[PDB]
Design a protein around this motif. Structure first.
Motif, PDB file in Angstrom:
ATOM      1  N   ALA B  45       0.824  -1.202   0.000  1.00 13.22           N
ATOM      2  CA  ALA B  45       0.000   0.000   0.000  1.00 13.22           C
ATOM      3  C   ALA B  45       0.861   1.256   0.000  1.00 13.22           C
ATOM      4  O   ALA B  45       0.529   2.257   0.636  1.00 13.22           O
ATOM      5  CB  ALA B  45      -0.953   0.004   1.192  1.00 13.22           C
ATOM      6  N   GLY B  47       2.793   4.342  -2.053  1.00 17.10           N
ATOM      7  CA  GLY B  47       2.836   5.140  -3.254  1.00 17.10           C
ATOM      8  C   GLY B  47       1.475   5.334  -3.885  1.00 17.10           C
ATOM      9  O   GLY B  47       0.454   4.860  -3.379  1.00 17.10           O
ATOM     10  N   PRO B  48       1.436   6.055  -5.008  1.00 17.52           N
ATOM     11  CA  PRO B  48       0.152   6.283  -5.691  1.00 17.52           C
ATOM     12  C   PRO B  48      -0.527   5.009  -6.149  1.00 17.52           C
ATOM     13  O   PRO B  48      -1.763   4.944  -6.157  1.00 17.52           O
ATOM     14  CB  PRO B  48       0.541   7.169  -6.882  1.00 17.52           C
ATOM     15  CG  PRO B  48       1.853   7.751  -6.522  1.00 17.52           C
ATOM     16  CD  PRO B  48       2.550   6.735  -5.685  1.00 17.52           C
ATOM     17  N   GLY B  99       4.504   9.789   6.033  1.00 12.67           N
ATOM     18  CA  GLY B  99       5.735   9.028   6.006  1.00 12.67           C
ATOM     19  C   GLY B  99       5.758   7.802   6.888  1.00 12.67           C
ATOM     20  O   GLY B  99       6.839   7.246   7.115  1.00 12.67           O
ATOM     21  N   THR B 100       4.607   7.367   7.402  1.00 15.66           N
ATOM     22  CA  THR B 100       4.570   6.189   8.262  1.00 15.66           C
ATOM     23  C   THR B 100       4.968   4.928   7.503  1.00 15.66           C
ATOM     24  O   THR B 100       5.730   4.096   8.019  1.00 15.66           O
ATOM     25  CB  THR B 100       3.176   6.036   8.864  1.00 15.66           C
ATOM     26  OG1 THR B 100       2.240   5.737   7.825  1.00 15.66           O
ATOM     27  CG2 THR B 100       2.757   7.321   9.547  1.00 15.66           C
ATOM     28  N   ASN B 101       4.465   4.766   6.278  1.00 15.17           N
ATOM     29  CA  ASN B 101       4.846   3.613   5.471  1.00 15.17           C
ATOM     30  C   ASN B 101       6.333   3.639   5.152  1.00 15.17           C
ATOM     31  O   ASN B 101       6.984   2.590   5.106  1.00 15.17           O
ATOM     32  CB  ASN B 101       4.020   3.572   4.188  1.00 15.17           C
ATOM     33  CG  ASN B 101       3.619   2.169   3.799  1.00 15.17           C
ATOM     34  OD1 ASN B 101       4.257   1.197   4.197  1.00 15.17           O
ATOM     35  ND2 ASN B 101       2.555   2.055   3.016  1.00 15.17           N
ATOM     36  N   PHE B 102       6.887   4.832   4.918  1.00 19.48           N
ATOM     37  CA  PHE B 102       8.329   4.948   4.737  1.00 19.48           C
ATOM     38  C   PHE B 102       9.068   4.446   5.966  1.00 19.48           C
ATOM     39  O   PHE B 102      10.060   3.719   5.848  1.00 19.48           O
ATOM     40  CB  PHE B 102       8.708   6.400   4.439  1.00 19.48           C
ATOM     41  CG  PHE B 102      10.185   6.617   4.226  1.00 19.48           C
ATOM     42  CD1 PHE B 102      11.048   6.746   5.301  1.00 19.48           C
ATOM     43  CD2 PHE B 102      10.706   6.702   2.949  1.00 19.48           C
ATOM     44  CE1 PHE B 102      12.397   6.943   5.107  1.00 19.48           C
ATOM     45  CE2 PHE B 102      12.056   6.903   2.752  1.00 19.48           C
ATOM     46  CZ  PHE B 102      12.901   7.023   3.831  1.00 19.48           C
ATOM     47  N   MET B 168      -1.460  12.775  -3.385  1.00 17.74           N
ATOM     48  CA  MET B 168      -1.477  11.915  -4.559  1.00 17.74           C
ATOM     49  C   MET B 168      -1.289  10.449  -4.210  1.00 17.74           C
ATOM     50  O   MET B 168      -1.763   9.578  -4.947  1.00 17.74           O
ATOM     51  CB  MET B 168      -0.381  12.356  -5.534  1.00 17.74           C
ATOM     52  CG  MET B 168      -0.534  11.843  -6.949  1.00 17.74           C
ATOM     53  SD  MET B 168       0.336  12.918  -8.106  1.00 17.74           S
ATOM     54  CE  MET B 168       0.085  12.050  -9.647  1.00 17.74           C
ATOM     55  N   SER B 169      -0.598  10.157  -3.106  1.00 23.25           N
ATOM     56  CA  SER B 169      -0.401   8.770  -2.698  1.00 23.25           C
ATOM     57  C   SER B 169      -1.725   8.111  -2.337  1.00 23.25           C
ATOM     58  O   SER B 169      -1.980   6.963  -2.717  1.00 23.25           O
ATOM     59  CB  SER B 169       0.564   8.712  -1.519  1.00 23.25           C
ATOM     60  OG  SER B 169       1.831   9.228  -1.881  1.00 23.25           O
ATOM     61  N   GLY B 411       9.409  10.377  -5.331  1.00 23.57           N
ATOM     62  CA  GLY B 411       9.497   9.249  -6.242  1.00 23.57           C
ATOM     63  C   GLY B 411      10.778   8.458  -6.131  1.00 23.57           C
ATOM     64  O   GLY B 411      11.250   7.912  -7.132  1.00 23.57           O
ATOM     65  N   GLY B 412      11.365   8.391  -4.939  1.00 25.49           N
ATOM     66  CA  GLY B 412      12.576   7.632  -4.736  1.00 25.49           C
ATOM     67  C   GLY B 412      13.846   8.306  -5.201  1.00 25.49           C
ATOM     68  O   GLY B 412      14.922   7.709  -5.075  1.00 25.49           O
ATOM     69  N   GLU B 415      15.853   9.068  -2.066  1.00 23.46           N
ATOM     70  CA  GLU B 415      16.362   7.822  -1.506  1.00 23.46           C
ATOM     71  C   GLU B 415      17.523   7.278  -2.329  1.00 23.46           C
ATOM     72  O   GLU B 415      18.518   6.807  -1.772  1.00 23.46           O
ATOM     73  CB  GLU B 415      15.237   6.794  -1.418  1.00 23.46           C
ATOM     74  CG  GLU B 415      14.237   7.061  -0.309  1.00 23.46           C
ATOM     75  CD  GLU B 415      13.164   8.057  -0.709  1.00 23.46           C
ATOM     76  OE1 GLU B 415      13.438   8.935  -1.553  1.00 23.46           O
ATOM     77  OE2 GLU B 415      12.038   7.958  -0.183  1.00 23.46           O
ATOM     78  N   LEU B 451       7.955   1.214  -4.824  1.00 19.78           N
ATOM     79  CA  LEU B 451       7.203   2.017  -5.782  1.00 19.78           C
ATOM     80  C   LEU B 451       7.095   1.313  -7.128  1.00 19.78           C
ATOM     81  O   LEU B 451       6.019   1.275  -7.734  1.00 19.78           O
ATOM     82  CB  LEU B 451       7.857   3.388  -5.945  1.00 19.78           C
ATOM     83  CG  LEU B 451       7.697   4.353  -4.772  1.00 19.78           C
ATOM     84  CD1 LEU B 451       8.554   5.585  -4.977  1.00 19.78           C
ATOM     85  CD2 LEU B 451       6.242   4.738  -4.602  1.00 19.78           C
ATOM     86  N   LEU B 479      11.220   7.359 -10.695  1.00 19.91           N
ATOM     87  CA  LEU B 479      10.512   6.473 -11.611  1.00 19.91           C
ATOM     88  C   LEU B 479       9.237   7.129 -12.124  1.00 19.91           C
ATOM     89  O   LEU B 479       8.540   7.835 -11.392  1.00 19.91           O
ATOM     90  CB  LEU B 479      10.171   5.142 -10.940  1.00 19.91           C
ATOM     91  CG  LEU B 479       9.063   5.079  -9.887  1.00 19.91           C
ATOM     92  CD1 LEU B 479       8.657   3.636  -9.654  1.00 19.91           C
ATOM     93  CD2 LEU B 479       9.489   5.715  -8.583  1.00 19.91           C
ATOM     94  N   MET B 491      11.656  14.959 -11.573  1.00 18.77           N
ATOM     95  CA  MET B 491      10.494  15.328 -10.779  1.00 18.77           C
ATOM     96  C   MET B 491      10.548  16.735 -10.206  1.00 18.77           C
ATOM     97  O   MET B 491       9.571  17.163  -9.583  1.00 18.77           O
ATOM     98  CB  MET B 491      10.281  14.329  -9.637  1.00 18.77           C
ATOM     99  CG  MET B 491       9.876  12.958 -10.119  1.00 18.77           C
ATOM    100  SD  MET B 491       9.635  11.803  -8.770  1.00 18.77           S
ATOM    101  CE  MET B 491       9.270  10.321  -9.689  1.00 18.77           C
ATOM    102  N   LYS B 503      11.065  13.591   5.576  1.00 18.01           N
ATOM    103  CA  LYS B 503      12.179  12.679   5.330  1.00 18.01           C
ATOM    104  C   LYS B 503      13.115  12.616   6.527  1.00 18.01           C
ATOM    105  O   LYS B 503      13.530  11.528   6.944  1.00 18.01           O
ATOM    106  CB  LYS B 503      12.946  13.113   4.083  1.00 18.01           C
ATOM    107  CG  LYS B 503      12.316  12.685   2.777  1.00 18.01           C
ATOM    108  CD  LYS B 503      12.604  11.227   2.483  1.00 18.01           C
ATOM    109  CE  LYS B 503      11.657  10.690   1.429  1.00 18.01           C
ATOM    110  NZ  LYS B 503      10.270  10.555   1.949  1.00 18.01           N
TER     111      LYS B 503
END
Ligand SMILES: Nc1ncnc2c1ncn2[C@@H]1O[C@H](COP(=O)(O)OP(=O)(O)O)[C@@H](O)[C@H]1O
Ligand SMILES: Nc1ncnc2c1ncn2[C@@H]1O[C@H](COP(=O)(O)OP(=O)(O)O)[C@@H](O)[C@H]1O
Ligand SMILES: Nc1ncnc2c1ncn2[C@@H]1O[C@H](COP(=O)(O)OP(=O)(O)O)[C@@H](O)[C@H]1O
Ligand SMILES: [Mg+2]
Ligand SMILES: [Mg+2]
Ligand SMILES: [Mg+2]
Lengths: 528, 533, 527, 56, 53
Positions: B45, B47-48, B99-102, B168-169, B411-412, B415, B451, B479, B491, B503
């Motif tokens: 779950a 990203g967009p 950013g919890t999923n991150f 957008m996510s 978009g990574g 990272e 992603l 990406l 981006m 971040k």
């Protein structure tokens, strides 16, 4: 349902005959054997697990026996004997159980033959009278004014306990506590170790720091931080009544119709509190101790006079403080008098021990109560130390009330046994055999001491008997640490005559009581 | 020779239901496996293109969302290492709001690579030290990756463009409309004073017309009716009372003592006259709307109707406080007429029906005020809950932007750049910490990998292209989601940007959680027993 | 079988060798568990309660409480460690280790037919000699800031991570130095410990003031006051009922209104007194007025105070009365009968901080605060609990190092030197108590052994290296946890509390002696 | 009193203090009455002719 | 911090040092009719507490 015709109940059990007597005697023997090894200077301690989750680590006979639940009524009788011995004289608890067991064994020996229990009982009573006479004959007096001899007596009392390592400190603490709690009023002397001479144990620290306080210490703090926590020469006032507005006894509903009556009532509540505080202040005290609550407004009004206040103190603690500082507890503040103010306490100080506040009143001149502050490794260690100190204080009180002294280490047992054996040679009846048997049953104490020391029982006991057959050897006993014969006027182990008399009387009467039973009925409803 | 007895010592002393885990294999590997499993559960779950999840809690409540924090909250996580990771995720949600999923993905990757390092020979201390060194290096590198700043927060277009990436996510298909709504709502709030209050944004959910019918109202909406007969006011002069709209009474006990017939015949008439006088005095100040926090008396309601006063009753004290804030009135503790300064004002108060719900609307004509309300429409309660979660994410993003205006490419891209820089740094560090530093750098690959996996393309090709383009010197390339084949694009021009604070805090919290999990060597678990709460 | 089981059939009994073996096995199990706690290189333990709460710790006392154990000997050792923690606040793990090693060394000789009494006599003699040697070896010093920093570091580095320990060292040292008065006992109740859950663990610090876990309950209260007059009171500003069942009686609505208005005059008088004092002290608007009340304040009084620009707090902690009196410098009031400006404390900054639903109030910039607060910050509840335990240990360590005029070298150096002294003194002991003395010395040697084992080095080689270095030069050399070579603990800065060592010796010897003399364990309270 | 699964609200290590307070807070436990801890025993209850009487 | 009940410790203290004589054991009901006629009999105004175990 089905109806069986019965005289007694279904759950009624009855047994009688030689079986009942044998069962009683073996129950007493088992009770004795439980604590047989907890007697002497080389006794070993036992761990008792409470049904409530606590742990008792002790070699005192009374605690061990009281921690054991039994079904046989003879064992219950033996435990009651242990408790009686503990409550009466406070020492000899282990010895009396062993003596009772040995006497019941030597009685069973005769009951196996065709001798009626009543004959054995009469012989036992004659022997008990002769033991009392011999003990009073071989006793020696003591000088209560001699502090060294009193300390020696307390030491010989506590050499068999875990506190024997710190013998001098414990002896001094016990002697000082007993001496200062000693009181005299209206021609009636008293000691009252139970009420006063409180022992407070605070885990932590070292046991060498334990001491008897020249006053009373309680686990309390000032009611408000602005109170003084250190007063040089305080004047103490003690109360029971609360310093707060309280409801009356009768139903006293009010009926407010005017506007200002509500505020007036609140103002008079405040005024009543102020009047009580002013009545207290009129005596110009420094400390106020109350058994009940103190209102915040009362605290403020007491602060205006620079008075330290402590509330919610137990009644026993307040009585102890009254005895220590020479005050009288007053209920109604308006009836305070000058002689009710406690002057004589030379210092009051609230200091922090660990993470708790403790109140010290420990500079009193001639205090009649004290707090024995015990510090040690943990809670169980301090509990055992408190039990040992209780034994020491009981022995000190027994010596103070009765200044007679009796040789220890089994010397008195052997002397009384030899005297009774010599006396039995001129009776020429059927009661001479039980008389001699119960006389020689006293040798179980030196035998137990030798067994616990680890020496040879038979050779040492034979040598001790041969020595006691001589002309002046009444004070010859056994050294419980080396397993050798020694004169007790040289070793110095002496015991109060009261303890020995109580032990012998209780053992003989326990044997007599258990020898009178041949029928047991159990299971019936309490019916009440 | 048929049974194995318990070892003497601690094994025999352990309680019947207790569990003891000690040593590397028994504790650390099990904890790492549990954390990896939790990260795997939440991974799909991200990203967009992240799919929604249907979660039913112990109370049969149904949640349809792709928010990692909500999923973790509604899940019954029992393993305590995963519990710590969930606490880290929730702390990230509380601190930043996104950013919890991150956090979860980074912690899982870090723990997996830590397990690999432990297996190849490194000790726990070396791995922890290398992870901390690499986290410090990443926090040092991060400020240099900032591509652009907000540079304006009072502009609707700029705020909408900034919040589009944030929302957008969640709700990938329709993010421009939601971005415009949240931008308008946030620009209404956030006055000349630099402070911004998240609470000042209210969300009202009403069924019926699809989320495209949602709108932003400058005021408040309450799902209730009016007590009186008046249902619409055009020049509202609200007077707010915290006390019930009733005659005040004594606090101890009130007894009406009647001693004559005259008092009995006059008591009710006097009470009614007093009520009428009080309501008339209230109405004489020009007040035409009265809001009360307590109950409304029958006589008070009758006299309010007689004097044409609109009555609204608010049960919640929070709603009363919010209404006072958004209108400008003081909650009077008594029923006295309001003074000029204490009187509230609003452009229009009226009773309206939205769908099948009766609502009372306090509406301001000016695009100003202290509180703004977003009215959410939709066809399902779960859909409106998800839209509300997206609105919360957007508002938290706006709050973060107010705190710090710096942005880093999404978009990574950030990272990948961090991974490259940390790998380059660790290649120059002699010692056993270089392995841990390199693994920490590699753990950043899990974000573009996730992603790409969710987007439906091959992650390896995407990561290879990202490394190639970043070695070329382009640090703003991530990406391309809207592509059927592995592709990358810049981006900074695409506007796919995420906050710097998000971040920073996510990296810090994920590293802390991973290190804390690694620090545990022995686990002693009590019997579960009860304790429902 | 046994005598007890005949009287009580369902009784659990262990006699003589059985009881001694049971006790020694329990002690050795506790020692085996708590070995890994010792030293800064020890391993963190993870404790999960029945409800599922997570607790990470290295403390010996905490681990003892949180192990699921139901053994009597474990209960006794737990009581001893609890007393150790309550009094000295440190050395619980060493307590358990020394007790277990003493029991093991005693069993080494008891299994050879030796009676435990001789071992206990040797233990007593060795304890006396060890206390004498410890008194000889203590380093009396002037407790400046550097020595306290070293002691606090030596405790906190063992308790927590190195960087967090470095922060907490300065925090605790400054907190202790702030509240310390010359030649007076240190009251640790005056250092508030407050937990906040928003920042990182290294953001914890010391506030030269107070932090209150509650804030103003009125929305119109000021959120920040620059120059504040502090009024600490214990007077109820909320509505109070008559004690004697007053009740009201009226005959008309006007009478009811008059009674309602007149029933609040009592509290309104005190609010008026507060407002009059505030207007007297600060006629202008720059200075602020802060009211901290232990009792409650009803909304009417809150509104009345807010209308005059006074920020008020209600239902404060009871200890906060003394804390505010010592920090701000006012007088705590139980009544407003005679209130004057001299009873007002002064704070140079009072502001409100909000964290989620939880609300905080900060009182800072005091003149010379004698009561400060430590703000524990961290992202997790278990992190906060661990930091709180570490802070408690560090505060106890610094307080002990101040109360004692001396400090003992750490790293096991004192244990090695004491064991060597005991070995030298052994020939002077007459009888077979020399075996007990040797057992006591070997048990004392457990601390360097466990330190080396935790650091990963070889136990025996490291121990013999330490002993050879100590014997060659006579210096107090301990174990270097990084290299394993001998190191002078005093020169490096590894310090141990003298009181902690003394309490360790006394308590361990007493409990070991008492356990060794136990020869019979019973549970005969049922039926 | 209808207490079932008392371990839920008392735990497994509840002491007599916990049970006493838990019973008191529902007002089922009778109030504590102060009494002599221990003393000597009398064991008599009225009966008849149990009356010293003045000689006349 | 009055809720922490420091008085609980001293409550345990004198509950431990409660009395001198034997503390007796909890009465055990062995038959269902025993429980029935135990509750049915005995004074009504006296509380009876039964522990199923
Ligand atoms: N040093 C000693 N040598 C020999 N016997 C001793 C010594 N000290 C005490 N005793 C004996 O031990 C007995 C006390 O044992 P103790 O454990 O106190 O049992 P109790 O509590 O029943 O008195 C006394 O009768 C005394 O004669
Ligand atoms: N249009 C897009 N194209 C590529 N990546 C995107 C786009 N929108 C968002 N992302 C990426 O998705 C990530 C956000 O994932 P999300 O589901 O919000 O997890 P979290 O809520 O934990 O941040 C961001 O790192 C961002 O770089
Ligand atoms: N930096 C260090 N180097 C060597 N030894 C240390 C160091 N820090 C602490 N120690 C040793 O570790 C011991 C403290 O261990 P700790 O975990 O605190 O046990 P406890 O909690 O029982 O005191 C002390 O005896 C000290 O000698
Ligand atoms: Mg004795
Ligand atoms: Mg997001
Ligand atoms: Mg320590």
């Amino acid at each position: 349902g089905h109806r069986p015709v019965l005289v007694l109940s279904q759950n009624t059990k009855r047994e009688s005959g030689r079986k009942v007597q044998s069962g009683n005697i073996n129950a007493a023997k088992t009770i004795a054997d439980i604590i047989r090894t907890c007697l002497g200077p080389k006794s070993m301690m036992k761990m008792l697990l409470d049904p409530m989750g606590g742990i008792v680590m002790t070699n005192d006979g009374n605690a061990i026996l009281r921690e054991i639940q039994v079904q046989h009524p003879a064992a219950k009788s033996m435990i009651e004997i242990s408790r009686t011995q503990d409550e009466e004289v406070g020492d000899g608890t282990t010895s009396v159980i062993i003596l009772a067991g040995e006497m019941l064994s030597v009685a069973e020996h005769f009951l196996e033959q065709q001798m009626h229990p009543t004959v054995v009982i009469s012989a036992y009573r004659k022997a008990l009278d002769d033991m009392i006479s011999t003990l009073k004959k071989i006793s020696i007096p003591v000088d209560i004014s001699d502090s060294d001899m009193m300390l020696n007596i307390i030491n010989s009392s506590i050499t068999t306990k875990a506190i024997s390592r710190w013998s001098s400190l414990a002896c001094n603490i016990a002697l000082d506590a007993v001496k200062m709690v000693q009181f005299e009023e209206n021609g009636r002397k008293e000691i009252d170790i139970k009420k006063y001479a409180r022992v407070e144990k605070i885990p932590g620290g070292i046991i060498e720091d334990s001491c008897v306080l020249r006053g009373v210490m309680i686990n309390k703090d000032v009611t408000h931080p602005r109170m003084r926590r250190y007063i040089k020469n305080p004047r103490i006032v003690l109360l029971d009544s609360s310093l707060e507005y309280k409801k009356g006894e009768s139903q006293t509903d009010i009926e407010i119709t005017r506007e200002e009556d509500f505020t007036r009532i609140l103002q008079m509540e405040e005024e009543y509190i102020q009047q009580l505080c002013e009545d207290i202040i009129q005596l110009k005290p420094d400390v106020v101790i109350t058994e009940k609550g103190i209102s915040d407004l009362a605290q403020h009004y007491l602060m205006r006079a620079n008075i330290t206040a402590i509330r919610r103190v137990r009644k026993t603690d307040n009585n102890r403080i009254a005895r220590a500082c020479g005050a009288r507890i007053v209920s109604r503040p308006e009836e305070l008098r000058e002689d009710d103010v406690g002057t004589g306490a030379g210092l009051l100080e609230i200091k922090k021990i660990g993470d708790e506040y403790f109140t010290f009143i420990t500079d009193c001149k001639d205090p009649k109560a004290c707090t024995i502050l015990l510090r040690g490794a943990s809670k169980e260690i301090l509990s055992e130390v408190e039990r040992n100190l209780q034994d020491a204080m009981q022995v000190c009180r027994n010596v103070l009330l009765d200044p007679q002294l009796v040789p220890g280490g089994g010397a008195s047992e052997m002397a009384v046994a030899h005297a009774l054996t010599e006396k039995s040679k001129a009776m020429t009846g059927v009661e001479q055999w039980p008389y001699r048997a119960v006389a020689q049953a006293l040798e179980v104490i030196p035998r137990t001491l030798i067994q616990n020391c680890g020496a040879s029982t038979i050779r040492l006991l034979t040598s001790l008997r041969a020595k006691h057959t001589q002309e002046n050897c009444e004070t010859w006993g056994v050294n419980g640490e080396t397993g050798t014969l020694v004169d007790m006027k040289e070793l110095g182990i002496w015991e109060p005559l009261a303890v020995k008399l109580q032990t012998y009387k209780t053992a003989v009467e326990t044997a007599v009581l258990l020898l009178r039973i041949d029928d047991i009925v159990s299971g019936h409803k309490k019916k009440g | 020779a048929l049974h194995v007895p318990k070892a003497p010592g601690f094994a025999q002393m352990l309680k019947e239901g207790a569990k003891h885990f000690s040593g590397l294999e028994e504790a650390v590997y099990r904890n790492i496996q549990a954390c990896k499993e939790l990260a795997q559960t939440t991974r799909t779950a991200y990203g967009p293109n992240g799919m929604n999840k249907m979660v039913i809690n112990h109370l049969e409540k149904l949640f349809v969302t792709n928010d990692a924090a909500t999923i973790l909250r509604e899940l019954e996580v029992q393993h305590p290492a995963a519990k710590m990771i969930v606490m880290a995720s929730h702390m990230q949600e509380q601190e930043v709001g996104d950013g919890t999923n991150f956090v979860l993905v980074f912690a899982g990757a870090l723990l997996e690579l830590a397990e690999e390092l432990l297996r190849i020979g490194l000790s726990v201390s070396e791995v922890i030290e290398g992870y901390e060194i690499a986290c410090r290096k990443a926090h040092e590198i991060l400020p240099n990756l900032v591509c652009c700043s907000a540079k304006n927060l009072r502009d609707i277009d700029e705020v909408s463009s900034l919040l589009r990436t944030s929302i957008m996510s969640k709700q990938y298909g329709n993010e421009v409309f939601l971005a415009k709504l949240i931008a308008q709502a946030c620009v209404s709030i956030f006055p000349d004073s630099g402070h911004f209050n998240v609470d000042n944004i209210r969300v009202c959910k009403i069924l019926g017309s699809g989320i495209s019918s949602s709108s932003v109202l400058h005021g408040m909406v309450f799902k209730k009716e009016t007590e009186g007969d008046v249902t619409s006011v055009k020049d509202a002069k609200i007077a707010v009372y915290s006390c019930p709209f009733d005659g005040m009474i004594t606090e101890t006990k009130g007894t009406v003592l009647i001693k004559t017939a005259e008092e009995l015949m006059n008591f009710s008439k006097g009470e009614e006259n007093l009520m009428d006088a009080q309501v008339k005095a209230i109405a004489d100040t020009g007040a035409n709307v009265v809001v009360t926090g307590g109950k409304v008396a029958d006589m008070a309601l009758h006299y309010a109707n007689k004097y044409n006063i609109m009555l609204v009753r608010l049960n919640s004290k929070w709603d009363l406080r919010r209404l006072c804030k958004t209108v400008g009135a003081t909650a009077l503790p008594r029923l006295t007429p309001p003074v000029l300064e204490e009187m509230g004002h609003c452009d229009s108060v009226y009773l309206s029906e939205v769908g099948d719900t009766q609502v009372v609307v306090f509406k301001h004509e000016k695009e100003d005020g202290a509180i703004s309300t977003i009215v959410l429409r939709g066809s399902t309660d779960n859909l409106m809950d998800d839209i509300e979660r997206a609105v919360d994410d957007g508002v938290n993003t706006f709050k973060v932007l107010t705190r710090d205006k710096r942005l880093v490419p999404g978009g990574g891209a950030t990272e990948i750049e961090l991974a490259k820089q940390i790998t380059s740094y660790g290649e120059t560090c002699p010692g056993l910490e270089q392995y841990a530093i390199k693994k920490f750098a590699e753990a950043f690959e899990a974000i573009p990998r996730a992603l790409a996996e969710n987007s439906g393309v091959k992650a390896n090709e995407v990561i290879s292209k990202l490394y190639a383009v970043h070695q070329e010197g382009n640090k703003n390339v991530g990406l391309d989601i809207e592509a059927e084949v592995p592709a990358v694009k810049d981006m900074l021009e695409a506007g796919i940007l995420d906050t710097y604070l998000g971040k920073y805090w996510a990296i810090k919290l994920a590293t802390n959680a991973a290190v804390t999990v690694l620090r545990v060597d022995q686990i002693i678990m009590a019997k579960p027993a009860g304790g429902p709460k | 079988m046994a005598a007890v089981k005949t009287l009580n059939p369902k009784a659990e009994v262990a006699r003589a060798q059985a009881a001694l073996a049971v006790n020694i096995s329990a002690a050795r199990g506790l020692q085996d568990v708590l070995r890994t706690n010792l030293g800064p290189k020890g391993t963190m333990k993870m404790l999960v309660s029945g409800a599922g709460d997570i607790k990470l710790t290295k403390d010996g006392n905490v681990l003892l409480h949180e192990m699921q154990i139901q053994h009597p000997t474990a209960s006794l050792i737990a009581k001893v460690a609890t007393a150790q923690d309550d009094i000295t606040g440190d050395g619980t793990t060493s307590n358990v280790l020394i007790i277990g090693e003493l029991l093991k060394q005693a069993d080494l000789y008891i299994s050879e037919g030796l009676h435990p009494r001789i071992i206990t006599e040797g233990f007593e003699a060795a304890k006396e000699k060890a206390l004498q040697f410890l008194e000889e070896v203590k380093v009396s010093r002037e407790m400046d800031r550097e020595t306290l920093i070293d002691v606090a570091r030596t405790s906190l580095r063992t308790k927590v991570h190195a960087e967090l320990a470095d922060v907490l060292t300065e925090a605790v040292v400054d907190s202790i130095l702030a509240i310390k008065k010359q030649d007076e006992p240190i009251d640790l109740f005056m250092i508030e410990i407050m937990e906040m859950k928003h920042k990182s663990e290294t953001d914890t610090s010391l506030i030269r003031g107070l932090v209150l876990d509650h804030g103003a309950r009125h929305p119109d209260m000021k959120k920040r006051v620059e120059d504040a007059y502090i009024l600490t009171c214990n007077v109820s500003l909320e509505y109070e009922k008559t004690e004697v069942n007053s009740g009201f009686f009226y005959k008309s609505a006007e009478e009811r209104e008059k009674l309602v208005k007149a029933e609040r005059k009592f509290i309104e008088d005190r609010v008026k007194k507060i407002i009059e004092l505030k207007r007297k002290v600060c006629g202008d608007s720059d200075k602020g007025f802060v009211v901290i009340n232990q009792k409650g304040i009803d909304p009417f009084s809150l509104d009345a105070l807010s209308k005059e620009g006074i920020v008020a707090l209600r239902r404060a902690k009871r200890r906060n009365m003394e804390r505010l009196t010592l920090a701000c410098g006012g007088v705590a009031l139980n009544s407003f009968d005679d209130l004057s400006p001299d009873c007002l404390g002064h704070a140079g900054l009072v502001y409100e901080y909000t964290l989620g639903e939880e609300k905080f109030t900060f009182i800072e910039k005091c003149n010379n605060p004698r009561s400060v607060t430590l703000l524990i910050k961290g992202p997790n509840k278990h992190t906060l609990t661990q930091i709180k335990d570490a802070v408690r240990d560090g505060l106890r360590a610094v307080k002990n190092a101040i109360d004692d005029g001396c400090v003992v070298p750490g790293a096991g150096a004192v244990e090695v030197a004491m064991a060597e002294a005991l070995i030298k003194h052994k020939p002077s002991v007459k009888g077979r108590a020399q075996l007990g003395v040797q057992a006591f010395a070997d048990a004392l040697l457990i601390i360097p052994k466990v330190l080396a084992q935790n650091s990963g080095f070889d136990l025996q080689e490291t121990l013999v290296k330490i002993q050879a270095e100590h014997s060659e030069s006579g210096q107090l050399v301990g174990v270097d946890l990084n290299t394993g070579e001998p190191m002078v603990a005093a020169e490096v800065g590894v310090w141990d509390n003298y009181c902690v060592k003394k309490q360790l010796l006394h308590s361990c010897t007493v409990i070991a002696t008492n356990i060794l003399l136990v020869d019979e364990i019973m549970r005969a309270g049922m039926s | 009193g209808n207490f079932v699964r008392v371990t839920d609200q008392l735990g497994d290590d509840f002491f007599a203090v916990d049970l006493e307070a838990f019973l008191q807070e529902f007002g089922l436990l009778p109030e504590k009455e102060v009494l002599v801890l221990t003393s000597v025993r009398n064991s008599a209850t009225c009966h008849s002719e149990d009356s010293d009487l003045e000689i006349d | 911090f009055l809720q922490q009940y420091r008085k609980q410790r001293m409550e345990e203290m004198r509950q431990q040092l409660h009395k001198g004589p034997q503390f007796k054991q909890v009465f055990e009901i062995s038959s269902g009719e025993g429980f029935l006629d135990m509750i049915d009999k005995e004074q009504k105004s006296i509380v009876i507490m039964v522990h199923i175990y």
